[PDB]
Every structure is written in structure tokens, then in C-alpha cells.
Design an enzyme around this catalytic site. Structure first.
Site, PDB file in Angstrom:
ATOM      1  N   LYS A  93       0.817  -1.201   0.000  1.00 51.00           N
ATOM      2  CA  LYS A  93       0.000   0.000   0.000  1.00 51.00           C
ATOM      3  C   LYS A  93       0.857   1.260   0.000  1.00 51.00           C
ATOM      4  CE  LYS A  93      -3.615   2.245   2.804  1.00 51.00           C
ATOM      5  NZ  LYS A  93      -4.561   2.129   3.967  1.00 51.00           N
ATOM      6  N   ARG A 125       2.119   2.057  -3.447  1.00 49.24           N
ATOM      7  CA  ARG A 125       1.078   2.568  -4.328  1.00 49.24           C
ATOM      8  C   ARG A 125       0.666   3.986  -3.947  1.00 49.24           C
ATOM      9  NH1 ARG A 125      -4.384   2.845  -3.021  1.00 49.24           N
ATOM     10  NH2 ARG A 125      -4.364   1.190  -1.418  1.00 49.24           N
ATOM     11  N   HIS A 147       2.684   6.251  -2.060  1.00 48.42           N
ATOM     12  CA  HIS A 147       3.743   7.238  -1.990  1.00 48.42           C
ATOM     13  C   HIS A 147       4.952   7.088  -2.878  1.00 48.42           C
ATOM     14  CE1 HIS A 147       1.604   8.588   1.591  1.00 48.42           C
ATOM     15  NE2 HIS A 147       1.475   7.300   1.852  1.00 48.42           N
ATOM     16  N   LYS A 155      -8.749  12.074  -0.898  1.00 45.98           N
ATOM     17  CA  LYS A 155      -7.676  11.997   0.075  1.00 45.98           C
ATOM     18  C   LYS A 155      -7.168  13.432   0.159  1.00 45.98           C
ATOM     19  CE  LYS A 155      -4.412   8.811   1.746  1.00 45.98           C
ATOM     20  NZ  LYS A 155      -3.301   9.747   2.102  1.00 45.98           N
ATOM     21  N   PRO A 156      -7.362  14.087   1.311  1.00 48.47           N
ATOM     22  CA  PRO A 156      -6.928  15.475   1.531  1.00 48.47           C
ATOM     23  C   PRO A 156      -5.471  15.823   1.159  1.00 48.47           C
ATOM     24  CG  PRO A 156      -7.585  14.387   3.615  1.00 48.47           C
ATOM     25  CD  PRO A 156      -8.054  13.525   2.487  1.00 48.47           C
ATOM     26  N   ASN A 167      -1.538  13.992   0.112  1.00 43.63           N
ATOM     27  CA  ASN A 167      -0.731  12.805  -0.157  1.00 43.63           C
ATOM     28  C   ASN A 167       0.616  13.156  -0.772  1.00 43.63           C
ATOM     29  OD1 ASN A 167      -0.693   9.764  -0.200  1.00 43.63           O
ATOM     30  ND2 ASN A 167      -0.305  10.170  -2.370  1.00 43.63           N
ATOM     31  N   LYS A 186       4.273  11.466  14.571  1.00 41.86           N
ATOM     32  CA  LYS A 186       3.239  12.432  14.948  1.00 41.86           C
ATOM     33  C   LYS A 186       2.212  11.817  15.905  1.00 41.86           C
ATOM     34  CE  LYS A 186       2.914  15.243  10.867  1.00 41.86           C
ATOM     35  NZ  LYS A 186       1.602  15.051  10.199  1.00 41.86           N
ATOM     36  N   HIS A 199       3.950   3.813   6.306  1.00 42.98           N
ATOM     37  CA  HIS A 199       3.250   5.069   6.487  1.00 42.98           C
ATOM     38  C   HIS A 199       4.174   6.275   6.226  1.00 42.98           C
ATOM     39  CE1 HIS A 199       1.127   8.239   8.843  1.00 42.98           C
ATOM     40  NE2 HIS A 199       2.265   8.385   9.498  1.00 42.98           N
ATOM     41  N   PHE A 200       3.633   7.306   5.555  1.00 44.28           N
ATOM     42  CA  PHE A 200       4.379   8.554   5.306  1.00 44.28           C
ATOM     43  C   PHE A 200       3.944   9.535   6.382  1.00 44.28           C
ATOM     44  CE2 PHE A 200       5.509  12.704   3.832  1.00 44.28           C
ATOM     45  CZ  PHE A 200       6.620  12.518   3.004  1.00 44.28           C
ATOM     46  N   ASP A 201       4.850   9.856   7.293  1.00 42.89           N
ATOM     47  CA  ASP A 201       4.500  10.746   8.380  1.00 42.89           C
ATOM     48  C   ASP A 201       4.641  12.225   8.092  1.00 42.89           C
ATOM     49  OD1 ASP A 201       3.358  10.242  11.004  1.00 42.89           O
ATOM     50  OD2 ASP A 201       5.106  11.278  11.830  1.00 42.89           O
TER      51      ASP A 201
HETATM   52  N1  LIG Z   1       3.717   5.697  13.643  1.00 49.73           N
HETATM   53  C1  LIG Z   1       2.673   5.431  12.857  1.00 49.73           C
HETATM   54  N2  LIG Z   1       1.719   6.387  12.675  1.00 49.73           N
HETATM   55  C2  LIG Z   1       0.648   6.091  11.904  1.00 49.73           C
HETATM   56  N3  LIG Z   1       0.371   4.946  11.243  1.00 49.73           N
HETATM   57  C3  LIG Z   1       1.352   4.026  11.435  1.00 49.73           C
HETATM   58  C4  LIG Z   1       2.502   4.187  12.207  1.00 49.73           C
HETATM   59  N4  LIG Z   1       3.284   3.043  12.176  1.00 49.73           N
HETATM   60  C5  LIG Z   1       2.615   2.227  11.400  1.00 49.73           C
HETATM   61  N5  LIG Z   1       1.428   2.741  10.929  1.00 49.73           N
HETATM   62  C6  LIG Z   1       0.483   1.984  10.092  1.00 49.73           C
HETATM   63  O1  LIG Z   1       0.535   2.438   8.754  1.00 49.73           O
HETATM   64  C7  LIG Z   1      -0.778   2.281   8.167  1.00 49.73           C
HETATM   65  C8  LIG Z   1      -0.919   3.218   6.982  1.00 49.73           C
HETATM   66  O2  LIG Z   1      -0.900   4.583   7.410  1.00 49.73           O
HETATM   67  P1  LIG Z   1      -1.990   5.625   6.874  1.00 49.73           P
HETATM   68  O3  LIG Z   1      -3.415   5.078   6.962  1.00 49.73           O
HETATM   69  O4  LIG Z   1      -1.797   6.926   7.601  1.00 49.73           O
HETATM   70  O5  LIG Z   1      -1.640   5.913   5.345  1.00 49.73           O
HETATM   71  P2  LIG Z   1      -0.883   7.075   4.554  1.00 49.73           P
HETATM   72  O6  LIG Z   1       0.474   7.220   5.178  1.00 49.73           O
HETATM   73  O7  LIG Z   1      -0.987   6.722   3.112  1.00 49.73           O
HETATM   74  O8  LIG Z   1      -1.843   8.380   4.753  1.00 49.73           O
HETATM   75  C9  LIG Z   1      -1.512   9.405   5.714  1.00 49.73           C
HETATM   76  C10 LIG Z   1      -0.185  10.073   5.396  1.00 49.73           C
HETATM   77  C11 LIG Z   1      -0.587  11.165   4.418  1.00 49.73           C
HETATM   78  N6  LIG Z   1       0.339  12.314   4.410  1.00 49.73           N
HETATM   79  C12 LIG Z   1       0.398  13.219   5.467  1.00 49.73           C
HETATM   80  C13 LIG Z   1       1.291  14.222   5.514  1.00 49.73           C
HETATM   81  C14 LIG Z   1       2.232  14.394   4.427  1.00 49.73           C
HETATM   82  O9  LIG Z   1       3.224  15.127   4.441  1.00 49.73           O
HETATM   83  N7  LIG Z   1       2.083  13.491   3.383  1.00 49.73           N
HETATM   84  C15 LIG Z   1       1.193  12.444   3.306  1.00 49.73           C
HETATM   85  O10 LIG Z   1       1.173  11.687   2.351  1.00 49.73           O
HETATM   86  O11 LIG Z   1      -1.871  11.605   4.840  1.00 49.73           O
HETATM   87  C16 LIG Z   1      -2.512  10.566   5.631  1.00 49.73           C
HETATM   88  C17 LIG Z   1      -2.916  11.155   6.964  1.00 49.73           C
HETATM   89  O12 LIG Z   1      -1.837  11.929   7.516  1.00 49.73           O
HETATM   90  C18 LIG Z   1      -1.723   2.519   9.342  1.00 49.73           C
HETATM   91  O13 LIG Z   1      -3.057   1.983   9.184  1.00 49.73           O
HETATM   92  C19 LIG Z   1      -0.989   1.872  10.521  1.00 49.73           C
HETATM   93  O14 LIG Z   1      -1.353   0.512  10.730  1.00 49.73           O
END
Ligand SMILES: Nc1ncnc2c1ncn2[C@@H]1O[C@H](COP(=O)(O)OP(=O)(O)O[C@H]2C[C@H](n3ccc(=O)[nH]c3=O)O[C@@H]2CO)[C@@H](O)[C@H]1O
Length: 124
Positions: free
Chosen positions: A7, A10, A12, A41-42, A44, A66, A119-121
Site C-alpha cells: 500500500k 502505491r 507514496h 484523500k486530503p 498525499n 506524529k 506510512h508517510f508521516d
Molecule cells: N507511527 C505510525 N503512525 C501512523 N500509522 C502508522 C505508524 N506506524 C505504522 N502505521 C500503520 O501504517 C498504516 C498506513 O498509514 P496511513 O493510513 O496513515 O496511510 P498514509 O500514510 O498513506 O496516509 C496518511 C499520510 C498522508 N500524508 C500526510 C502528511 C504528508 O506530508 N504526506 C502524506 O502523504 O496523509 C494521511 C494522513 O496523515 C496505518 O493503518 C498503521 O497501521
């Protein structure tokens, strides 16, 4: 179905190019990768570096996530990225995005074995 690792790629990853494709890159990219199917998606981020380079970040600088978790990592070097932010004018299903190219350090959350990005933080 698709693994968390899958995921992340796909959502990022986009090595095929070097910079912000066009002014309409996000509109296309966001739609192609299926991130506008159930809701616009707000925000990405797509990273333009080898999969290997990105995977490598899981063993780089350990930083706080975060969400308070400790499984995040910041890239020592800056990477080419494209930020996709939903316009206010945007309207589901015609999700609209602003495209912004930047060179910054990325912060990703990694999990599992192998320990890969899921995950992209953030980008800094
Ligand atoms: N420390 C952690 N914090 C959060 N989740 C964590 C984690 N460690 C593991 N996981 C796991 O990853 C899965 C996918 O994570 P997301 O559903 O957030 O999917 P995206 O990154 O695509 O979606 C996120 C990131 C994106 N985003 C935000 C900010 C930015 O700069 N860019 C960007 O692409 O926007 C969305 C909201 O901010 C989780 O279900 C969880 O199980």
C-alpha cells in the site's frame, strides 16, 4: 489482500520521474493510484527516488512519529518529493489537487520483517 508495504508503494512511491511532473500531476497521480475512490484523500506525498533508497530510510535517523509512536525515521539526505493537497474548489468525485515539488527530508513509519515503510508521516 495487499500488504501494508504494498500500500505504501502505491500511495507514496513514484520513481519513474525526477520532479513534479506537471501542474496536473496530482490530479492524475491521485486518481491513478486509487486515492480518490472513496473520498478525496486530503493530502498525499509521492517520493521520486528508488524503492531501495526509500526502504533504506527505515535504518536512518530515528525520530518521534506524529502519533507519538517511536517507529518513524527521517532521511539523512533530502529526496525529491511531490506534495498533493486538495484544493478548496475540489469536489468529490472530481477530486482536485494542487501540485508542489520540493526537495526535503522525508519521515516514514516502518513495521514488520522485513522492516519496511508502511506510512508517510512528514517531510521537513
Ligand atoms: N507511527 C505510525 N503512525 C501512523 N500509522 C502508522 C505508524 N506506524 C505504522 N502505521 C500503520 O501504517 C498504516 C498506513 O498509514 P496511513 O493510513 O496513515 O496511510 P498514509 O500514510 O498513506 O496516509 C496518511 C499520510 C498522508 N500524508 C500526510 C502528511 C504528508 O506530508 N504526506 C502524506 O502523504 O496523509 C494521511 C494522513 O496523515 C496505518 O493503518 C498503521 O497501521
Amino acid at each position: 489482500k495487499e500488504t501494508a508495504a504494498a500500500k505504501f508503494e502505491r500511495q507514496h512511491m513514484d520513481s519513474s520521474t525526477s520532479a513534479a511532473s506537471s501542474s496536473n500531476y496530482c490530479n492524475q497521480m491521485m486518481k491513478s493510484r486509487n486515492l480518490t475512490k472513496d473520498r478525496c484523500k486530503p493530502v498525499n506525498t509521492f517520493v521520486h527516488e528508488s524503492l531501495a533508497d526509500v526502504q533504506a530510510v527505515c535504518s536512518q535517523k530515528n525520530v518521534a512519529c506524529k502519533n507519538g509512536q517511536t517507529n518513524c525515521y527521517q532521511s539523512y539526505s533530502t529526496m525529491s518529493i511531490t506534495d498533493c493537497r486538495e484544493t478548496g474548489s475540489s469536489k468529490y468525485p472530481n477530486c482536485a489537487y494542487k501540485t508542489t515539488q520540493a526537495n526535503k527530508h522525508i519521515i516514514v513509519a516502518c513495521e514488520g520483517n522485513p522492516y519496511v515503510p508502511v506510512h508517510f508521516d512528514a517531510s521537513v
